[PDB]
Amino acid sequence: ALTTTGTEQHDLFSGTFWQNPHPAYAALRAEDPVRKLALPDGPVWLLTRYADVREAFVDPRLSKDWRHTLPEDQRADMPATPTPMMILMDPPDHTRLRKLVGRSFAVRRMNELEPRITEIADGLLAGLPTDGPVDLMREYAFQIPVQVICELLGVPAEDRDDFSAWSSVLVDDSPADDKNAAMGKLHGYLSDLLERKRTEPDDALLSSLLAVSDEDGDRLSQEELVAMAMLLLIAGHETTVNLIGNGVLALLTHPDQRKLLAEDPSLISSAVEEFLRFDSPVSQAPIRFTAEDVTYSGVTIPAGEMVMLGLAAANRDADWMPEPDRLDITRDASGGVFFGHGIHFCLGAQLARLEGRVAIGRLFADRPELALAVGLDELVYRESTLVRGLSRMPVTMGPRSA
Ligand code: HEM
Ligand SMILES: C=C1CC[C@H](O)C/C1=C/C=C1\CCC[C@]2(C)[C@@H]([C@H](C)CCCC(C)C)CC[C@@H]12
């Protein structure tokens, strides 16, 4: 034929990356799939190809134990975790903690929460202004997961605002000092709340887990109790919020797919799968450590290195998804790493899908003329190597439905 070559170098975790990371991710899969990142907190490797990410998630040589950084002999002297969360642990501890809490997020248990969710969603849709510009993140995307997780756990939703500040400090790329403060406040708050729970119990998870703790220290230590609370609280809001944000923006930017869902509202399940694929809310999985030398797409990652798996990146891999940049809500897809894979698979996957489906299906039913109240390039993203997430979303809700 006849051709010319275009080069284009994209910012990785600075500048434009926060605005739109996908072109950066797309260059990575094709030319640099296993990439050492000189972050100012030392090297952290990034895997961007689907196959590779998938295999890594079940590769037993890839531990959640930070002591793999330190030489063999120093592993005894040090704690297994910064905080005894199951997401930061390998089996057998992980197994024990996940088994405790498993039943409480069972598929069908979450399914019967759906009417409650739908109520909460409608409650805000009944209460939002018809003409003004509203922030959809803080007034809608935030609320639904926060409120739901709080009612589930037994947290006074009076404190929504309080802990969510500390929560977004831990999730965003904050100074190491800033995060310590937040964890201390979270830990401190949750310790106090659990104490107040010894005096007066409810039906919710914390009450239940508290009893298991007190009655069988080997099943759940006090520290594991608090840390388990920190995790469900945090994974409570800071993930679904961005499924709802990203999922909404996707429809606003793709009038054709918006159209499809308006004519067949039952496409909502299929759509939520596509949103999670198309703009994955958890962009990179939390850090994994090499327990020993590994090799992916022909690149060795030494023993004792940190490793992020590129979730947002991998779900746009052509090798897995035909035409991966097309937003197609009609897809009947399987696999997809947005929720993880293997023994650490998202505990709230079903809950999250329900929140997504209701939050978005209801919003687009109740408000046909919903529109961005700003330019696409005016929207601001949180700087986080863990969530792809909007800070705010100015929109006009427009009139309601007849
Ligand atoms: C759309 C929103 C959500 C996304 C994108 C998401 C993503 C994930 C991913 C990718 C993992 C595995 C991390 C890894 O292997 O490194 C995960 C684990 C987990 N998630 Fe979800 N999640 C979402 C909603 C939730 C909700 C609503 C809960 C409710 C409690 C939740 C609780 C958990 C817990 C406890 C773990 C650790 C599981 C374990 O290690 O056994 N997440 N989340
Ligand atoms: C991990 C390491 C590895 C060890 C580093 O020294 C510090 C570090 C921070 C990460 C954290 C700490 C707090 C809890 C966090 C923020 C997790 C968070 C509570 C989970 C929410 C996302 C998940 C649901 C996918 C994800 C990353 C976790």
Give the Cα separation of 142 and 244 in Å (integer): 9
Composition of the chain by helix, strand, coil, percent to 5: 50, 10, 40
- Tell whether 150 is in a known binding site: no
Find the length of the chain: 402
370: Cβ below 6 Å to ligand 2? no
DSSP string, 86-97: GGG--TTHHHHH
Token reading at 311: 């979730």
Locate the domains of the chain by residue range: 1-402
- From CA 248, how far away is CA 276, in angstroms rounded? 11
Give the full edge-to-edge strand order of the sheet including 34-39: 34-39, 42-47, 306-309, 288-290, 62-63
Q: What is the resolution of this structure in A?
A: 2.6
Expressed in angstroms and rounded, the spacing between residue 287 Cα and the centre of ligand 2 is 8
* Gap from CA of 16 to ligand 2 centroid (Å): 24
CB 143 within 8 A of CB 237: no
The CA-based dihedral angle spanning residues 105, 108, 109, 110, taken in that order and rounded to the nearest 10 degrees: 70
Integer Cα distance of 40 and 160 in angstroms: 32
**231, 43, 340, 104 alpha-carbon torsion, rounded to 10°:** -10
Nearest of 89, 346, 98 to residue 240 by alpha carbon: 346
Read off the tokens for 7.
């080069």
CA-CA distance, 20 to 3, in Å (whole number)? 28
For a ligand 1 pocket test, name from 66, 289, 346 the mutation site with the most ligand atoms within 8 angstroms of its C-beta: 346
Hey, what are 385's tokens? 């190597």
What are the DSSP calls for 128-181, one per residue? Answer: S-SSSEEEHIIIIITHHHHHHHHHHHT--GGGHHHHHHHHHHHHTT--HHHHHH
**How far apart, in whole angstroms, are the C-alpha atoms of residue 152 and residue 105?**
10
Are the beta carbons of 50 and 333 closer than 8 angstroms?
no
Rounded Cα–Cα distance for residues 375 and 145 (Å):
27
The alpha carbons of the chain give a radius of gyration, in whole angstroms, of 21
**Cα angle 194-199-201, degrees, rounded to a multiple of 5:** 70
Q: Which ranges of 264-348 would DSSP assign to H, the alpha helix?
A: 268-278, 311-314
Mutate to test the pocket of ligand 1, among 93, 99, 230, 239 (most ligand atoms within 8 A of CB): 239
CB 313 within 8 A of CB 336: no
Give dist(CA 306, CA 164) in Å, integer: 28
DSSP strand pairing (394-396 vs 299-301): unpaired
Strand order in the sheet with 371-372: 133-135, 394-396, 371-372
Round to whole Å and give the CA distance between 292 and 59. 11
Residue 344 burial (10 A CB sphere; 0-12, 13-18, 19+): buried
Beta 306-309 vs 42-47: how paired, if at all? parallel
The values of phi and psi at residue 135, to 5°, are -90, 110
C-alpha–C-alpha distance, residues 28 and 319, integer Å? 14
For domain 1-402, give the fold. Answer: Cytochrome p450 (1.10.630)
The span from the CA of 338 to the CA of 314, in Å, is 9
Buried b (16+ CB within 10 A) or exposed e, 270-301: bbbbbbbbbbbbbbbbebbbbbeebebeeeeb
Cβ–Cβ < 8 Å for 373, 292: no
CA distance 133 to 373: 6
Sort residue 306 into left (φ over 0), alpha (ψ -120 to 50) or beta.
beta
Torsion, Cα 342 348 352 355, to 10 degrees, reads 160
Strand partners, 163: none
Residue 203 sits at φ, ψ, to 5 deg, of: -90, -15
Region for 127 from its dihedrals, namely left if φ exceeds 0, alpha if ψ lies in -120 to 50, beta otherwise: alpha
Contact of 322 with 345, CB cutoff 8 Å: no
Dist CA 228 CA 233 (whole Å): 8
CB under 8 Å to 370, separation ≥6 — which residues? 252, 363, 364, 395, 396, 397, 398
Q: Could you tell me which residues are beta bridge partners of residue 289? A: 63, 306
How many Å apart are CA 143 and CA 165, to the nearest integer?
Answer: 14
Q: What is the largest CA-CA distance in the chain?
A: 79
Question: C-alpha angle with apex 172: 293 to 161, nearest 5 degrees?
Answer: 140
Q: Whose CA is nearest to atom 17 of ligand 1?
A: 346
53 CA → ligand 1 middle, Å: 16
Burial of residue 390, with CB atoms counted within 10 A of its CB: 0-12 exposed, 13-18 middle, 19 or more buried: buried
**DSSP secondary structure of 267-291:** GHHHHHHHHHHHT-SB-BPPPEEES
Q: Residue 396 CA to chain centroid, in angstroms?
A: 26
Structure tokens at 397: 């809700």
> Which method was it determined by?
X-ray
Let me know: does 213 contact 221? Beta carbons within 8 Å: yes
Helical axes 143-153 vs 160-171, angle rounded to 10°: 110
Distance of CA 255 to the CA centre of its chain: 26
CB 327 within 8 A of CB 278: yes
End-to-end CA distance of the chain: 57
